């Protein structure tokens, strides 16, 4: 049993595009001449930009941070560790899923189209039919390829902006109680135990209390 039938074989797929055969019967994806259509959802992989943060003043990524997209690495007298920021990751996930859903929704039309036949004295109608088919196929192929290529650019800039905004949010909290060493890290002038570290990642750091020892 199947949902779609082509002259070559049957298909189960929920994908929005296919490149098997232009003639289909049933509930089928849209036909294009493309050979590859992949959409990015994550970031650049640097297991070693418009906003200058990713592959910028922060040189590489972390393979030790596994529970999110952006986060912190801390070090004090009680130890070290990685952690992720949940709010930033949640906002990014909301945006990305909305984008993909919108792309899927905008590309749904009618289907179940089959060809016609003509006799020897009907060549002009045959040529007109062929011209219509070719024109529509060309237009839709162009649309799909351009859309994917253009959205792939915006996703990476979105991630870069998120990283930069998190960095500035942390920077403007510590003011002059810490030293900026320029690679994404801050050195505290006073002593910061696990509670002070938690407060920094919390958004409720107390600047008057810790005024440089």
């Amino acid at each position, epitope marked *: 049993d199947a949902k779609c039938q082509t002259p070559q074989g049957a298909i189960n797929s929920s994908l929005p595009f296919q490149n098997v055969h232009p003639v289909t019967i049933g509930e089928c994806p849209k036909y294009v001449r493309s050979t590859k259509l992949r959409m990015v959802t*994550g970031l650049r992989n640097i297991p070693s930009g418009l906003f200058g943060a990713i592959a910028g003043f922060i040189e590489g990524g972390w393979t030790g941070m596994i529970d999110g997209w952006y986060g912190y690495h801390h070090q004090n007298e009680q130890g070290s560790g990685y952690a992720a920021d949940q709010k930033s990751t949640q906002n990014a996930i909301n945006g990305i899923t909305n984008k993909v859903n919108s792309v899927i929704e905008k590309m749904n039309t009618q289907f179940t189209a089959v060809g016609k036949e003509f006799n020897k004295l009907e060549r002009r109608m045959e040529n007109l039919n062929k011209k219509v088919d070719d024109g529509f196929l060309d237009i839709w192929t162009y649309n799909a390829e351009l859309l994917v290529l253009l959205e792939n650019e915006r996703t990476l800039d979105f991630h870069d902006s998120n990283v930069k905004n998190l960095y500035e949010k942390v920077k403007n909290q510590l003011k002059n109680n810490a030293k900026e060493i320029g690679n994404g890290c801050f050195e505290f002038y006073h002593k910061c135990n696990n509670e002070c570290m938690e407060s920094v990642k919390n958004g409720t750091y107390d600047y008057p209390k810790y005024s440089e020892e």
Partner: antibody
Amino acid sequence: VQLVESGAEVKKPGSSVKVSCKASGGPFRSYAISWVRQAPGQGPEWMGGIIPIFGTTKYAPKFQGRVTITADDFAGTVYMELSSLRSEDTAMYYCAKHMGYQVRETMDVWGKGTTVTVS
Amino acid sequence: VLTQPPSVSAAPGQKVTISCSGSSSNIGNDYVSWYQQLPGTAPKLLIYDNNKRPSGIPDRFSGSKSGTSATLGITGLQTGDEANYYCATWDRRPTAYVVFGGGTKLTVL
């Protein structure tokens, strides 16, 4: 958001059963989904969950080794497969959604529950 | 595991509290949620983030957590409040997993 599960099952000991959960809205979700079961005369019990985009799965220590949770995202479906069906595995099964993308203790939307009998 | 009193009963118009006690691994270092379950229905979330309610939950339901033990409280008790109440938390040490309480069956007279 509404969650709908597949029909009830009656299966023999030693076999395997696979159930599915379908969620309304856009096919791609920004929250995590977990599977829970309740035996007659007992409280709820967590089995495992799956995280969006990252695609990582978590399982309970007692169900580890014989439970597999998978997701098909372009149709919005989540599958749970259980093997080595013993007699005690007859219960009601729910798919529940979380508030965020992480598997935690708070589930705000539940399904209706479907029955699995192992006789 | 989390431990609750097996059963509590009270009069209509009374206020009653259900306790949920465990160790420092589940409640001593994590938040607590409270669910309500009526016969033939899925559990309903009453309390999350140790003292907070979702939309649609009346004022009479309240929660709190002190040290190791977490308390749920129902005031202005009604006949429709006769249900099973469960506490849940995110145990996280060997391999983190959601733990529910044993359950408390509340009866109205």
